[PDB]
Amino acid sequence: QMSILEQRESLPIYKLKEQLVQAVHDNQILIVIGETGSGKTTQITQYLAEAGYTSRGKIGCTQPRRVAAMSVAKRVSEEFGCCLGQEVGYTIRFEDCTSPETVIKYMTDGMLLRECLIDPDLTQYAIIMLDEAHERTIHTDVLFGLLKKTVQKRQDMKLIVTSATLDAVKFSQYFYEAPIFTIPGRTYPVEILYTKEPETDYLDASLITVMQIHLTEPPGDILVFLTGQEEIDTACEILYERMKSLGPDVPELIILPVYSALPSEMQTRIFDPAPPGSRKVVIATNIAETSLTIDGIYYVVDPGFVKQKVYNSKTGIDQLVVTPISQAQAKQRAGRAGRTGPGKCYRLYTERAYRDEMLTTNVPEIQRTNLASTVLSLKAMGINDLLSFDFMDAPPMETLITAMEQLYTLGALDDEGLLTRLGRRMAEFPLEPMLCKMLIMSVHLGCSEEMLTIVSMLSVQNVFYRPKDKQALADQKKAKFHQTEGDHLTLLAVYNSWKNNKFSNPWCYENFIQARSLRRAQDIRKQMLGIMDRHKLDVVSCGKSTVRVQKAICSGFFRNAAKKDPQEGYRTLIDQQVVYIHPSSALFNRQPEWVVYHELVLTTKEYMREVTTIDPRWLVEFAPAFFKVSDP
Ligand SMILES: Nc1ncnc2c1ncn2[C@@H]1O[C@H](COP(=O)(O)OP(=O)(O)O)[C@@H](O)[C@H]1O
Ligand SMILES: [Mg+2]
């Protein structure tokens, strides 16, 4: 098959096209409600560009995730009839696919937030579309407050807020009782199937269900909800092996992973219809709940888990953890099987577990995460009265205080809670405050050439290639890069030996390093170097004096200091928690007295990820505010 125009005119939103453009015309702020797949993200931009709003400025539309922003900009450029990056483009952290021609721009919420820092009145935009607002992320909640302020100054601007939920009433009341525009649409019955007893391994259960659906259920594609990439990559390998084990007579199952770090060629495959006699299985994360819309899906497999940030209010530390979904999310997952016809949802949990063991809705991200980055962004925009900031769902006053005192000990805020030269310099980088700090400190410590590489290597995933077939051999290849001082300097050694071997792809194959990842680090480095140069921050090498690198790391990650326990593992300096060096660490067979880790990862044990050896003396030297027992 059907032409792009026929596909576009088949969408539920098409029936309300003229009435939608008139509503935008008549109202400064409009709340748009419609079920997922009605065409809000992809058509609202196009309708208003056609109405002529692009003559006044850009039409910007936020997306919560990378794959969402890239996919919708690719589709909309095919529908618009242009090059991707020309009239229609996207902006993600470290990838700006826009140009002087761009009139429709899809960007992550974090990217629009970074634009507010530079231009608080968003004068470049005629229309701001806060999309997928029901997902309620820190960046979305921050953008509501910022745009509430913008709408007052910019009388010419148009603000469209979308929702796939009746949480539109809260958004309407928030935005001066703004009108609500409803896109009616057909929702079909979904047969919800629960397990009689819980499952030991939800991964196994998902695979068994997928094969049972594929072999015994009428045609329709399958959507599987998993928690991350490692888990998705594994599920795909086993499913492929298991399907191969059935023999050549068996009908084809097209196994399609979906996650943030996916090559764009892999991203387009998930939207192609299956050939006749074949079936698709899309193995995705919670991106597939609302952000991505795949046609032909009639079956959903739901293990009931999601990876989400949990916060400790006492210690001020947040962490990504695998927890059950809210009841609202279970309904969203099930609904994906009832978009184009009746479907089935296989819940890999009991009816009792749904009814009792599940929260109605989850707590907004702003009330279950560390606010240091948020507070730093707000202080950089001149927003010092944090109590005066109009949040839709206010974080606890204790959290805003915790966030303030952390930036203080970092040296971003002074005694009067105002930004310092450090804080200002830190705010110029799209990185988390502990990463900014160590980059700005490396300028003073004379190792910014090294820190630019380390910050970049830490901003990429999957640096080392470790196939399931060649695991022992991979580990032998990785050990050749192992530095006595730790993981951060091992990451610098990988990049420098790649650079010295003239950025060779065959060198990467030989050494089991992932060339795509080093090429991404090189790109991030080029961009970070650009900021240093604009702000005249000196780029100096430490030569062989790598202790300077260690001091710089410590100056930013002192909160993550740990001491070796004489019996088992390490005890964190902050809450005296038992933490462990992971078997993949350069320090695994040389565990020092004191370390600093990049992040904590919860698997079987609480593991420290990216560990560097420190002198405990540096804690007093680089974080003196962070101490008690200071007088007689
Ligand atoms: N790359 C893509 N990204 C997003 N949607 C796509 C893509 N390719 C095709 N589509 C189609 O676009 C249609 C319209 O969806 P969309 O505008 O995202 O709706 P809504 O925002 O209301 O959920 C969907 O039916 C989907 O299959
Ligand atoms: Mg959408």
Q: What is the DSSP string of 376-398?
A: HHHHHTT---TTTS--SSPPPHH
Element (H, E) at 297: strand 297-302
Of ligand 1's listed atoms, the one at least distance from the Cα of 11 is: 14
Tokens encoding 423? 């804080």
* Ligand 1 pocket at CB < 6 A: 11, 34, 36-43, 71-72, 74-75, 271, 293-295
Beta bridge partners of residue 504, listed in sequence order? none
Q: How far is the CA of 271 from the centre of ligand 1 (A)?
A: 9
Q: Which residue of 262, 293, 294, 336 sits with most ligand 1 atoms within 8 Å of its CB, as the best mutation to test the pocket?
A: 293
Instruction: Yes or no: say if 299 and 273 are a contact pair by the CB < 8 Å rule.
Output: no
Mutation to probe ligand 1, out of 42, 88, 130, 160 (largest number of atoms < 8 A from CB)? 42
Q: Are 38 and 13 in contact (CB under 8 A)?
A: yes
Closest C-alpha to 47, from 84, 85, 74, 9: 9
Contact partners, residue 496, CB within 8 Å, separation at least 6: 453
What 3-state class would DSSP assign to 615?
A: coil
List, in sequence order, every residue forming a beta bridge with 322; answer none if it has no partner: 307
Which ligand has an atom closest to residue 84 CA? Answer: 1
64 CA to middle of ligand 2, Å?
Answer: 10
Neighbours of 15 (CB within 10 A): 14
CA distances from 176 to 139, 260, 485 (A): 21, 36, 56
104 has which bridge partners? 59, 88
The neighbour count for residue 424, using CB atoms within 10 Å, is 14
Contact of 348 with 202, CB cutoff 8 Å: yes
Known binding positions: 34-41
Which-ligand-closest: CA of 291? 2
Annotated resolution, angstroms: 2.6
Q: How many angstroms is it from 291 CA to the middle of ligand 2?
A: 5
d(CA 118, CA 528): 17
Closest listed residue to residue 448, CA positions, set 522, 535, 514, 537: 537
Residue 603's identity, in one-letter code, is: T
Q: Tell me 198's DSSP state.
A: -
- Contact criterion met (CB below 8 Å) for 146 and 177: no
What is 409-463 written as a DSSP string? HHTSB-TTS-B-HHHHHHHTSSS-HHHHHHHHHHHHTT-HHHHHHHHHHTTSS--
Distance CA 40, CA 131 (A): 8
Q: What is the CATH number of domain 190-365?
A: 3.40.50.300
471: buried, middle or exposed (CB in 10 Å: 19+, 13-18, 0-12)?
exposed
Q: In this structure, what DSSP letter does residue 481 have?
A: T
Tell how far the Cα of 8 is from the centroid of ligand 2, in angstroms.
14
Q: Which CATH architecture has domain 4-183?
A: 3-Layer(aba) Sandwich (3.40)
What ligand is nearest to the CA atom of residue 35? 1
Element (H, E) at 170: helix 168-174
d(CA 351, ligand 2 centre) in Å: 30
Token pair belonging to 89: 């483009």
Exposure string over 591-617, b if 16+ CB within 10 A, otherwise e: ebebbbbbebbeeeebbbbbbbbbeee
> Whose alpha carbon is nearest atom 7 of ligand 1?
75
Q: How many CA atoms lie within 13 A of 58 on its CB side?
A: 25
Contacts of 37 by beta carbon, 8 Å cutoff, 6+ apart = 12, 185, 293, 339
Alpha-carbon distances, residue 401 vs 328, 422, 490, 622 (angstroms) = 31, 20, 36, 22
- For a mutational test of ligand 1's pocket, the pick from 14, 44, 45, 75, i.e. the residue with the most ligand atoms closer than 8 A to its C-beta, is 75
